[PDB]
Amino acid sequence: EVQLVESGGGLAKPGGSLRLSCAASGFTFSDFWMNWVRQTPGKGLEWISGINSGGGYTFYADSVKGRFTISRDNSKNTLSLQMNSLRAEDTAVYFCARVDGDDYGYFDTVPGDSKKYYFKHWGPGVLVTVSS
Amino acid sequence: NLWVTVYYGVPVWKDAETTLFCASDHNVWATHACVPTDPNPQEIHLENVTEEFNMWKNNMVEQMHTDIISLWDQSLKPCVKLTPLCVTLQCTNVTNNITDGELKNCSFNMTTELRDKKQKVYSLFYRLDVVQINKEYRLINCNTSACTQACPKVSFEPIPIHYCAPAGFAILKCKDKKFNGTGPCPSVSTVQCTHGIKPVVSTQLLLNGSLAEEEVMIRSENITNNAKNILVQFNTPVQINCTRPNNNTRKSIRIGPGQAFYATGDIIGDIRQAHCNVSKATWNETLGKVVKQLRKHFGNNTIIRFANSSGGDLEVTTHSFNCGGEFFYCNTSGLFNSTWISDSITLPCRIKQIINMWQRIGQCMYAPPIQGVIRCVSNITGLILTRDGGSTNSTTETFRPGGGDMRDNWRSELYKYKVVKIEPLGVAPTRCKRRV
Amino acid sequence: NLWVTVYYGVPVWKDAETTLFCASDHNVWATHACVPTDPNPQEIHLENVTEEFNMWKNNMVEQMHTDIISLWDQSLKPCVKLTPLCVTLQCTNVTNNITDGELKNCSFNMTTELRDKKQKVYSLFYRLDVVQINSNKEYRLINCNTSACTQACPKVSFEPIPIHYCAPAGFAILKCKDKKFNGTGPCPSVSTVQCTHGIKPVVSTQLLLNGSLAEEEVMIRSENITNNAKNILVQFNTPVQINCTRPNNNTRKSIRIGPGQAFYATGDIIGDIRQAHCNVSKATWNETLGKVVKQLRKHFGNNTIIRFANSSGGDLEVTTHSFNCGGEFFYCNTSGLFNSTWISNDSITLPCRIKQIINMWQRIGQCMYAPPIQGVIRCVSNITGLILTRDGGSTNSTTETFRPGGGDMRDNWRSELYKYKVVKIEPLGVAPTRCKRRV
Amino acid sequence: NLWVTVYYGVPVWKDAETTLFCASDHNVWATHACVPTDPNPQEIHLENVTEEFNMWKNNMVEQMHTDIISLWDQSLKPCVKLTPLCVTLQCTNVTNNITDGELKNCSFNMTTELRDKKQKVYSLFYRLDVVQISNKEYRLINCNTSACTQACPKVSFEPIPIHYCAPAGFAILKCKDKKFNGTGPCPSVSTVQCTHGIKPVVSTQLLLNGSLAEEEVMIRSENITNNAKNILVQFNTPVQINCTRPNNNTRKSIRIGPGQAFYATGDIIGDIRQAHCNVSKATWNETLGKVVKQLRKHFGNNTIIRFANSSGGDLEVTTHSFNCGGEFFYCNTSGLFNSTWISDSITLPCRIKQIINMWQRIGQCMYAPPIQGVIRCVSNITGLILTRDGGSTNSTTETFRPGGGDMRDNWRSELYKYKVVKIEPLGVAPTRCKRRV
Amino acid sequence: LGFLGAAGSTMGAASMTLTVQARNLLLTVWGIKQLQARVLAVERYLRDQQLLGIWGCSGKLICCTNVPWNSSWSNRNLSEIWDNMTWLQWDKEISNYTQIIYGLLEESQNQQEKNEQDLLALD
Amino acid sequence: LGFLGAAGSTMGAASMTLTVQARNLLLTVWGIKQLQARVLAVERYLRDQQLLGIWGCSGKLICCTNVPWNSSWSNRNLSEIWDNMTWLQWDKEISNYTQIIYGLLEESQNQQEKNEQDLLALD
Amino acid sequence: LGFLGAAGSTMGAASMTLTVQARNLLLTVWGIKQLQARVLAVERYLRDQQLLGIWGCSGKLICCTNVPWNSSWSNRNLSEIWDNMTWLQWDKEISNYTQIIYGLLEESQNQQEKNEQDLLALD
Amino acid sequence: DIQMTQSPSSLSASVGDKVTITCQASQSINTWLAWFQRKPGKAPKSLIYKASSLESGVPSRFSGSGSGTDFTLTINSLQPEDFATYFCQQYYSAPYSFGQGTKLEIN
Lengths: 132, 436, 439, 437, 123, 123, 123, 107
Ligand SMILES: *[C@@H]1O[C@H](CO)[C@@H](O[C@@H]2O[C@H](CO)[C@@H](O[C@@H]3O[C@H](CO[C@H]4O[C@H](CO)[C@@H](O)[C@H](O)[C@@H]4O)[C@@H](O)[C@H](O[C@H]4O[C@H](CO)[C@@H](O)[C@H](O)[C@@H]4O[C@H]4O[C@H](CO)[C@@H](O)[C@H](O)[C@@H]4O)[C@@H]3O)[C@H](O)[C@H]2NC(C)=O)[C@H](O)[C@H]1NC(C)=O
Ligand SMILES: *[C@@H]1O[C@H](CO)[C@@H](O)[C@H](O)[C@H]1NC(C)=O
Ligand SMILES: *[C@@H]1O[C@H](CO)[C@@H](O)[C@H](O)[C@H]1NC(C)=O
Ligand SMILES: *[C@@H]1O[C@H](CO)[C@@H](O)[C@H](O)[C@H]1NC(C)=O
Ligand SMILES: *[C@@H]1O[C@H](CO)[C@@H](O)[C@H](O)[C@H]1NC(C)=O
Description:
Chain B is mainly beta. Chain B is built from four helices and 32 strands. In chain H, 0% of the residues lie in helices and 50% in strands. Chain H is globular. Bound molecules: a molecule of 6 linked components (NAG-NAG-BMA-MAN-MAN-MAN) and 2-acetamido-2-deoxy-beta-D-glucopyranose (4 copies). Chain B: Residues 309-319 are annotated as: CD4-binding loop.
């Protein structure tokens, strides 16, 4: 069925940069929103990013505003999450998550913005650590 | 001595042009407007009179052309226009149980009942009415004109319409079974209204027409001229079975307030290409009769070949027609493929929604999809062939299906009709002097 | 001995139908185009003439209905179209001196002259003109999902001025002057007239306003009383005055929605908001109902318990008295009138609802937005008839119940065209005589 | 011993009203609907016939005016409307070789063929067609009144002649008498089924391409003592006027939508110069002398006749307008009417305008698309529309200023020779006849 | 009397007032209704005039004909027709017999015209 | 002389061109306008023909009746009418008196009709 | 025989069927054309009737005028013209000489009218 | 932010024993909440959506209930493959929130 696979994780220097990639399969990547969630060891999950099907309306969490940059390539059916100015607490297991439904139907300015979505499909999760 | 005398009401007529009114017994052609036809159409046979007819110079065909175009244009005005539909269409192929790669699945944004809200919908569009703008496509009509969505409540059934001349005019019907198309007719009759003329729209094959009386008839303005289309009329009908087993699903998309756009939702079941079946035995004997009649004009001991269309637009290179609302474009290369000296044929067909009727531009039309499997049976009662010349004719002649305009198509029905203006006034000598 | 002779111009007529043109002394009916009626309408009596009339099979009512619809559509053709008005409305209750929550204050982003920008405007809409789509709340006009219609031109008035129907040459209009003549039957007193009397194209439901008056007594008409599905037309000999009004004192606001197009929105209400009502005298209505029940009893037989009840139910256009005067379309709840039973300075106040978007012709896909008008409305008129409907009644013949009816607008004008009928003049005639031609 | 006798087909007529039908030999002024003209008109002269003509109460001018209105309205219907063009305009003065800074280089976001995609384009608009909303932002004129309709490029504005003919049962009386002042009995009258070729020209303050007089300049008015009524002047000789704009605008085709295109004004090749008109000083001087000579007969001798420019108002009446080539001119004619009379060429500055209201109507604006190449409009003046200003004979000086405000006066100078009448074939007269029983 | 005033009067009394009836036989919605009505009236009048012309009674309100009166149409004499009856019931009783009479009148007029031409030819 | 060419000529000479004067009497908006003008001309011609028809002058351009000419209408001599005055001046002189003449001719033709019918019946 | 049935028959014999031919003289796409055709037929019929009227042959199917036939129009015997030739051939033979005959008929009727007027006036 | 609290943080139960997990919301979120299950090392799987609708293909033993601010998941019988981490996500209003995470261990 639908399967999401990640890569690009690894050791990174504090204050440096890194990039994450998640490949989608089993569904039409150009019709479902994408989101990023991280799980730091010892505490619960914390949502950090999201993007629509068309690549616009990039909305992040206040704790990662500006530093991170979510982007997608519909042609290659892949998602990317550029990281800049990394810190120590950013060490976490990152999961790429696909919303429950498509973006079809009524919409105000961005397809799917008027619909409640939940992360039906999730990726295995890649542990990223930032230490010297 | 002789004196002139005025006679009123003499049976004298002169050729003239007039506007004949329609007559007939929820359809594109106005039915309520046409006056009810007489249940007992009178036909007076005239004896000892021969009239000269001319199918090519007949004004009835031109008037019918203008009336059909006018009715078609006015039939689209009271319903939905697809002007906002021109938008960037993200489209991909349809590979769910398919054997033909034409059909495409397009998604796009559209307006809704509210002006401040949009909607992302999808529709299945054929490759013929979709052109790539660069996985990005757009409609072929966006750079030409905004098509007007055909009314769904009206039917495209070609109901027969009788053309009746007004008072003071009469219609002469040539009953000569061997009419050659032009020239003197030794047997004419006066009729107030013509027979049922079904306005069937087709190219390269005259469907649901009038059959000949004795044998296959070939008519042409100039047999020796290659630029003049050769009309053929069959004495027996060649049954044709056309179908679309796709079983399309219609979905109403609220394009705007009070107006809806009918789109092709999904194709349930195996997708198969549309086609038409024609019995090869009947077609073989029919072509034999046609070549036998052709040899009468082109002489004997000449090989006659039947080849497909040379080239051009899809409307002229393929047998276009309407069947159950859907507009078909069938490739007739399998029929006109043979040479004459001394089981069923399946014709691949394609369907297009965005069409440009009457060979005009700027006034395109969008045929909405029809639910269910489409299937229809027609009678191939004629042909429109085009002959190509050669050096000293090289003892051979090649005929190809001619995609002539609609006047040639409608001329096959009005070949035995002509309008004449009555002239009741007449003066002749007689031996009588008016009393002072 | 006897030879046939031809006579031209004989006084002979035959029943037929034709296109009767208008005649009168801007308006939606476009009365300016009608031919100027003569100041002395000729009317010739026909002694010893009896003709059979039929109000139900009369073609003049159908022709008038078609013509009225065509004129109304033509009148709305050059007016502004409110198609961009379909947007998400942020409505809130107008809790400012109200005694009812039937009015709402909505705000929305409407287009302007320059299509590259929008303007924030607000207007007041009645509860009947908006529907929730899920303390502000999203709303939508009821005609958005059905059909976007135009706005009635303010300069064009809806005053039902009378229009005279005339037949062309070779045709004649037979006016039945015989009093007490019911719906169908021979008329022992016929008179030919070139044009009909001034017929006011009044639009109303369940009651006839500004109509014709009965000659002597209240007249009850129907195809046959035995059929419960056939409407009953009643005509009053003495009319009852009816006074309708809305003391809200509405205000108009012109919004430049586009180049050359303006939307006449409803501004803020000045003063105290009061429900639109309508009054009818108690004594006059009681005596009128007495005459009506007397005639009904005469037709159905004495000792019949006649009862009057309000409308059973259905659409708002048929369950309420629809008005058309001044510019606003009222819907009065007539339950207070038909609330009496009969055996063997006070006034009745009828609550009325005002609706802007209307579908008066019972059609789907074509509506009309009536813009608000300045000042208070004082619509004084008089009732001259009713449209009643009798229920099944079952085998209990001892009592009968009547409720207001509708569903067919032609009945409104049918009460005015019951005296006329068009016929074809047959001037050719043949009769025997002893004369013959001479060679 | 007299009995009445009925005569049919009597040659008697009377004034009446009727709907005359057009006739003529891609034209807004006259379409193919008009029936072909008569190659040999039946100019039948009527001896010993005297009819009371009147050009002011004539209904032919109003009827033809209504007809022209109908043609102009219907001609714009089969082509593109400029309703989405009313948007904010970022205009900047053109300074690439200029004297006259009246042109504005505007830019805006126009919708392309696809509804979901925009297009940034630029077009040159005259300052008369734009109005400030910020000093950088502008808006096209008439956007707050109606959506102008772009003129169909297929149809031209060339005034082809129009032959007005009366229907069956009616007749048209042509006043052949010379020196006819437009009112009163006409000693020489001739009947004709179709009027002469009337050029449907539109102009203000001066008449162009009209019919010249017979022997001398003619002054016509309801009554000279009233100033509220205009004065129509007809010249005996034509006064050649040359008009042209040195700038050859470039046409840019911008696809506003599916099957719709907006012809914007592109960059000007070479230097930019103001449009103008020329009129020979000698011809205009002698023409004004003849006009003054004719006016002296009506106002008496030893009177000072003065000429002054228009008083004031909108540009439609205060300037002289043309309709030729495609561009709508508005020329300041103050250089012509700047002289006084006791007892090499004149150059008239001119302006161009695209958004116009020809018939002075409200809500029926039109956009004139630009035309390629330098346009030359050579024509000749054949009349004037003057207005007199004065008081209770305070001084022996009468001042005349050009006028307008009524487009029918333009055709009034051409239809003054005709008058439609209704034939009355029935007649009765006494005779010594009696039917035998 | 006026238009249709003699409808109830007897046939004899109604024969003197045939001229008034003869004289009386001749925005966009009202425009087309008026034009259509005028055209219909003109066509009806012309049809009646042509029918009278082909019978030899053109320009005559009352005319005699050489077509004998067949008793099959009505077994009644002039006493109760011209003195105790109106034109209305008379037409009702002859609703269908008019076509045969019309045909007879047509053939009689044509034969009479040919005979008159021949008679003029001998002289 | 041509159509309407004898307007200025005397009555004696103008009566010679009655045939020419009588023979010359016969987008969607423009189409309706043309149809209105055509039907108007047809209606005028048919009204004139109907007036002549009701009178005893159907099908005759020059026709004299039995209605006496009252001196009130005009006491002028015939020589100074037919050989000195034109038809136009004559129309402007008795323009208001035409209605009375029309009515007198109407009753006269009706009386002649009934007289002819009675004379043919007594045969 | 029906409408135009005697078209192929020779002249004279077809003259007995003139009435059958004479009786036959009388959305928006099918409406405006119908109205136009009706009005066209009306004007054609009225033009024919006007020609017959000016020639003094109003209401006469077989009219005989006192105009001398010119042999230059057709050099053939009367018997051959009637018994061995049709009306179509006859129209085709004199298709160009009809205008002069029409004008001659008009002037002759005018002369007849003035002669009749003088005869009644002098008597 | 609409913080979410899940309890108990850990629970030990035997095979076939009923298990109940509850989680509250700091503000009313009506019923827009979905539950999940993350096995050790594998990606999470959706179990309940709309807080009451059962996800297609998941066994019928899982059941969700609750409304407003309090929601709860019930397991009628703990099967040998049911031990894993469970989460509860709120999606009534962004930003999304998740529970602290509860692990079920065999007794
Ligand atoms: C219904 O309407 C919505 C709008 O309401 C519409 O969504 C829009 O879709 C279009 C494409 O159809 C999007 O256009 C793209 O815009 C970006 C702008 O850059 C954004 O992203 C970058 C990187 O994330 C950010 O840095 C930046 O700040 C912006 O957020 C362009 O970069 C895209 O360029 C692509 O197309 C070019 C065509 O020439 C290519 O040359 C170019 O290489 C790009 O292609 C690749 O790049 C994208 C990013 O990697 C990738 O997503 C592409 O698939 C491809 O691999 C392009 O112009 C627009 O942003 C959308 N807007 C919103 C608000 O979502 C829906 O598409 C419409 N519905 C339908 C059915 O069409
Ligand atoms: C018959 O038609 C042919 C053309 O198809 C033509 O060449 C021939 O002359 C015609 N014969 C006639 C008119 O008798
Ligand atoms: C007119 O255009 C041509 C080229 O199109 C250019 O050579 C010429 O300079 C232009 N005219 C002027 C006056 O600049
Ligand atoms: C003839 O007329 C007389 C009246 O004079 C009447 O009594 C008789 O019945 C009539 N007979 C017929 C056969 O009509
Ligand atoms: C006009 O009047 C003169 C006066 O002598 C006369 O001779 C002439 O005949 C009249 N008519 C015409 C048409 O010239």
